[PDB]
């Protein structure tokens, strides 16, 4: 569990992210696609994108980035009590999209890298550790749902 102090660090930097959801959302998906090309293959919707320039130019990609961050934002603001928000997400990603747990770890690294790049002053080592724990909590709860459904 994260302490109240750790949650405050997480939410403080997340408030900054909400000032430019589209920009943050776009950078995170591009980071993920570049570092782990296999993740792009899960998206029939973005499979055609080959270069980073093509990726930055896609409005549909930017739109999806907003969907991912707003859904994650809703979860983080729940400070651990995210049962109702997480269940639906685990179900679709396990049974419909077929997203292995490892890919969730990849996008977690992408989120941390982007937060560090856009907010050096508010994303120090202490905030970085708090965010990592929050994302680990996110992955832990999702993995439990996957196991229940038979997806590891
Ligand atoms: C921070 C973690 C993530 C969050 C919050 C998230 C959230 C969402 C949401 C809200 C949707 C739309 C509704 C739904 O189907 O549930 C969605 C769709 C989808 N997600 Fe994720 N996702 C995450 C990570 C990933 C990862 C790591 C992958 C793939 C490697 C992925 C692949 C997909 C795909 C393929 C769709 C369907 C896209 C379409 O055809 O419109 N997601 N995700």
From Swiss-Prot:
Its EC number is 1.7.-.-, 1.11.1.-. It catalyses: Fe(III)-heme b-[protein] + nitric oxide + H2O = Fe(II)-heme b-[protein] + nitrite + 2 H(+); H2O2 + AH2 = A + 2 H2O. The modification Phosphothreonine is found at residue 67. Signal peptide: none annotated. The gene is MB. GO terms for biological process: removal of superoxide radicals. Residues 1-147 form the Globin domain. GO terms for cellular component: extracellular exosome; sarcoplasm. Pfam families: Globin. This is Myoglobin. Belongs to the globin family. Keywords: Cytoplasm, Heme, Iron, Metal-binding, Muscle protein, Oxidoreductase, Oxygen transport, Phosphoprotein, Transport. Monomeric. InterPro entries: Globin, Globin-like_sf, Myoglobin.
